[PDB]
Each structure stands twice: as C-alpha cells, then as structure tokens.
Symmetry: D3
Subunit: 138 residues, 6 copies
C-alpha cells in the first residue's frame, strides 16, 4: 500500500533497494538487521590494533535486537508484537552467548524462533543478523 | 497465543514451540531431539560417535511438527510454508523421500537449503513452518 | 483450502512434492525458486570449454525474479504485491551483481529483504535461490 | 591420472579422487532422477587404490607412504572413510590428517587424498 | 621398523595411524588437537547446559604443547619444526590463535599456513595443527 | 641458523614466522596471498560502494609471482617447486585459477592439490598457495 514500506530515519541505510520494514495487512516484515551503524562501522566488531575486526556475538546480538526494536517503534509497534524470529549466525560456537542475549528480550509468551549458521552474511565482520515478523493490526 | 507443548523437547532458548498471530501459526525450527535431549536418528557407533540418519531425523522432525500443531488445534493439512535446513545436500534425496510421506503438491510451499551448521552437531535436518488456521 | 495450492504450467517441475505457490488467507507463499528451466537446463550456468558449468549471478538472479513474477501472475498477483524476499546466495562475492539486478525489479517502496549465503543449494550450478511472501487479498 | 613428482628420496603425489580419465566417477552412481549418490566407502577405496597405482608407476607402494592428508566434505562421512583407511594402512604406517573442506573440485566427490612417500632410488 | 611412533600419555589417534612418522631425516606429525588422553578436550569445557564452549586460546596452547611432547618423545623439539599447517574452523578465532602461536615460535622458525576448514573431526575443536620437522638421526 | 628467511620488500607475514624455511635440501614456503607490502590487496579493488571485488585471475597471478620472488631470494626458482597446495574459497573460481596456474607451470611438473576452504585469513582473498621446493645447497 501507499505507506506500507518505511525507511527509518537514523538507522543504517539498507544494503540494497528495500525498506527496513514492510506492512502487509496486520503484519510487519522487518528486513534482516545487523549491528552496522549508519556510518558503516559495526557495533560489536571493534578492530584491534592491527585493524582486524574482533566480532563479539553478545554485543552484536544486543544491538541487532535494539535496532529491530527501533524499527518497530517507527511504525507504531514494539518487541512485544514480534511473532517469528529467524536468526542467522556464522558459527554455532557463538550460540550460547547469542541465546543469553536473546533471553534478555523475549519471554514466555514471545515469538517462534529458528537459529542456523549460514556460510556468510553480507559483511565479514557480522556474526549475527536477525529478520522478524511482527503482528499489529492498525 | 504462545505455546509450550508438553512431552516435546524443551526449546533451546526462551521461546515457544508455536506462536499464534491472527489466523496464522508460526512453528519454531524443529529437530529430532527428544525431551530427554537424546536425538532420534543419531545413534552413536561403538566409539561413541553419533551416526546421523537423515531419513530417521526427517521423519521425526515432521512428526514433531504435527504434534506441536495438534496441541493448538491444527494439523499438517494447515501448513502453508515449509523451510527446510539440511547441512549437506548429499542428504537431499532421502529427505525428499520422507517429505513426500507427509505432504503433496496440494500442500505447503517449500524451500530447502543446506546451512553451515545447525544448533547441535548430530543434526542433519531442522524444519520451521508457517500454518494457517483461523480460530 | 481445495484450490489454495498451484502448480504453474510452463514452470520447472518442483524438486519435491510441493506446489509453486500456496495461498493462505490474503497471503501467497512462493516456493524457493531457481533459474532452472522447464527442460531442467539452467539459465546462467553455461559450460565453459571443458564442459564445466560457469555460474553467472547476474543472469541467474534476473531469471529467478522473472520466474517468481510468472508464478505470482498465475494467481492474479505481481511483483508489486511482494512483501518479503529471502535470498540465498552461495558466495558473498556474488552480492554486488545480485544486488544490482534486485534493483531492476524492486525499490525501497517494495518488500523487506534478507540475503545470506548458504552452504549449498539443491543443484551445484546454482548461485541464487529466492523465496517470497506476497500479499494480495482475493 | 594425478601426477607424482620425485624430489630427492621423496615422492609427492597430487591430490587424488575417484574420478576416471574419462571424467566419470567411481562411487557416485546417479539415481533415476540423475542426481549423483556419492558413496564415501567406494570413493575412499578407489582413491587409495589409485594412489597405489600411481606409486607403483614409479617403483614404490603404499608401504612407502609417510604422510596422508585427507580432504572430506562432510564429517558425517568420517567413520566409513576411517574403516576403509584401515584396510590399507595401520599404526606402523604414515602420519595422517583429516579435515572437511568447503568444496572439492567436483560436486560428486566426498574425498580426495594427497600423500608424501619415501623411497630412495 | 622404528619409524612410526605411538606416544604414551597422548590421546589415541582416531584412526589406524601413529602420532609421528620418520622418513629419512624428516618427521611428519599427524594433525594434533587439544583432545586429552581421556578423550575430553582442553579448551572446550561444557557450560551450565552441558554445551561445549570452545576457547581458541586454550586449545591452541594445548595443541602446540602436545606437538612438543610428541617431538620430544623421538628426540626432537619445536626448534626442529620446519612447516606448520594450521586448520581453524572460524577465522574470527585468528587473532587469539596467532598470539598463542607467538608463544612457541618466531620468525627464525617454521613456515606457516593457516586456513579455516569446513569441519574438524570433533565438533568441539576450533584448531588442529599438522607439522613437518627436520631432525637427522 | 640461516635456514629461515624474511624476504625483504614482501608483505609482512601475518604472524611470527618467515616467508620460507629450509630443511636439508628442501624449502617450505608459507601460504602466500596477493597482499601488497602496504597491506592493501592486488585483485580486490573496491567497487563504487567501497565493497571489494575479488578477481581470481589477478590474485592468482600475483600469488605465484610473489612465490617466485620468495624462492629467488634464497637462490631458487619456480622450476624447483615440487608440491603445490592451493586454497580457494569457492570452486566457481577454479577454472580461471587453473588457467593462470598453467601459464607458470607444466601440468606434469609439480604435484598439486586444490581445495576450497571455509575461510582464508583476509576476506578479500580468493586464493592462497603454499609450496614445497627442492634445491640442495
Ligand atoms: Mg514472464
Ligand atoms: Mg579400477
């Protein structure tokens, strides 16, 4: 519909020609979200002295879910409206720490979840990207 | 709207097996893992080394998905999207054979990929589904 | 219901016992789609001089989206009804060319998008498969 | 066939697969759908047999092998590969290292092995 | 002959092969992990839920220590190593692995090649190292 | 004593190791990439968006030229190479890599093994090669 898609001010510009979130009837589809900042630096991938990124799954996961919360808030929803989470790791050795952060945000009572490790995410510094579906009738 | 199914394996994290949203049901990625955290279809050999069996795991995964749906008054006939995550495409033909025991071309859309890893090294398949069932 | 699933005439036969597209209320779920033709050859994987397939992400991505359009058209919908795109690459070095083709078809007023590289797709010649969700009330 | 190169007392054998000179594969029989069914047991046995043939071409044999590097694609294939390996070598034989790689050069392959052998002239 | 050696007090090899094989003046050491004799793993202690928590620093240190023990059992030492091949599973582990490597070797020591493979033979491993050493009898 | 060499003017090794190590009559050359001395990369020019675009042909040619330089610094040349181990990251790069390889080497020259690994030590890389050469003093 006319204003179904939203680019959210203050968030990182999407990697391609697509919005952060798309409404469809009562549903909201949130594009895969990373810890990347608007200046194209990465939360939780601070380079060390040699310039080598040191990815931190705890820091990136917390920032990804925080970013998703901001996106939902821009279209009148919040984390309590999320009904499906798809989480893409790059290494399952990051699972325990990612799971610990996930539990800071989602309770009983929360969305369905699926977690897999993919071969690569779109930037080599990423160790997590999450896409969600949310439900909130207008 | 959210459901923890009894006698199914306790979810890896703070999430239900299934979540209702309006007329829809979202089912979390499901494996052959039993409640006691052993796995159907990953029996250890004599050295203690698990031997994954894609046919056995796939059948148990879909059976488990059926059970989850049934706990909220739905069934496999209500499934509309299947996403399947293998770890090696050489397991495709067996997975494909078991899939056909449960679904046909009047059933759900299906997407199948091999991922780098599933959450337990014994696993060779996990499936998540979307189902449609107005109250 | 009885006519909710559709096998589309003129499209490649699905790899398993499933339809090209499935309606659920106002939504349409489109099965993961490749550049495979109805005759089981592939667009964008021409053999080189030794017979070794040479995958071409530009050509495959264009064919995949063209095919998704065909499937949607067969049930009275179109790319403008798409609301979520999930793209599966095998090599992130293919991302830039994939991204360029995606922009030929969709823009920021269109669907949410998620892109990851998987370990393997169902045929070794493939470098992209895409599944979509569309929204089109009857 | 994969090539062997002598260097002093040593023989370096190119990574060897179950592929034939005519580009067909031992141990990846296609189903009626045309999709290959890679078999680690058949491929491993053929690879080690192929390495034996290459070594015999230059006067050596598997008893002269001193290092084995094995490349799988799927560690779920390990147990069966391991059993075939034991048909040809034992603990008095070569050092061995086994990993799974992201890809081998052909999608039908589930094993490739490179070896170093020692056979002074 | 005496060319192949099974080193006492080390983890039993997972196939029918020795820890180290001599060939003329050379020693080939089989790929070595942090796995202990009792088949537990240094640097992959299970957490609260029983899930292994791999630690590249701890595993890398134990790997090179095991290789040192193996060489010392045949009268060689790390000063004799001439080629190191390191197999990670995740390049995000590189920096910590690299720092541990420097505890044992320097630029007067062996050539080194480091890659991340798809899988090692046990899922808890984040490093395995194969070496070639040179030690004339 | 003089068996290890850090080759002047080449990209600095990523860790505490030399470019090449002698062992008796053999030379072991560390895995080599297209990385320049200033730690930029040949064959991975960024596109408009600043995203690197790896080029297997350009990287492979630079890798072999670098290996030639390293061998020449210790008095050897490509003719002395007896084993080649090549690490790709995607087999769709294989044909082009092989074409460049054949510009330098006879196919019945050195023994060769080519696999695709999960990752190389820098994400811009699509090829790294390690060699063993034979050159008695
Ligand atoms: Mg058309
Ligand atoms: Mg024969």
């Amino acid at each position: 519909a006319d204003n179904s898609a939203k680019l959210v001010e203050g968030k990182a510009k999407p990697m391609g020609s697509f919005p952060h979130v798309k409404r469809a009837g009562d549903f909201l589809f949130v594009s895969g979200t990373s810890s990347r900042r608007p200046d194209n630096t990465f939360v939780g991938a601070e380079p060390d002295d040699t310039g080598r990124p040191r990815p931190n799954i705890e820091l990136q996961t917390r920032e990804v879910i925080s970013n998703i919360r901001d996106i939902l808030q821009s279209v009148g929803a919040d984390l309590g409206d999320v009904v499906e989470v798809c989480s893409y790791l790059v290494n399952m050795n990051d699972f325990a720490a990612y799971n610990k952060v996930y539990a800071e945000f989602f309770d009983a009572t929360g969305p369905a979840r699926t977690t897999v490790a993919v071969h690569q995410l779109p930037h080599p510094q990423l160790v997590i990207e999450i896409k969600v579906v949310a439900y909130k009738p207008l």
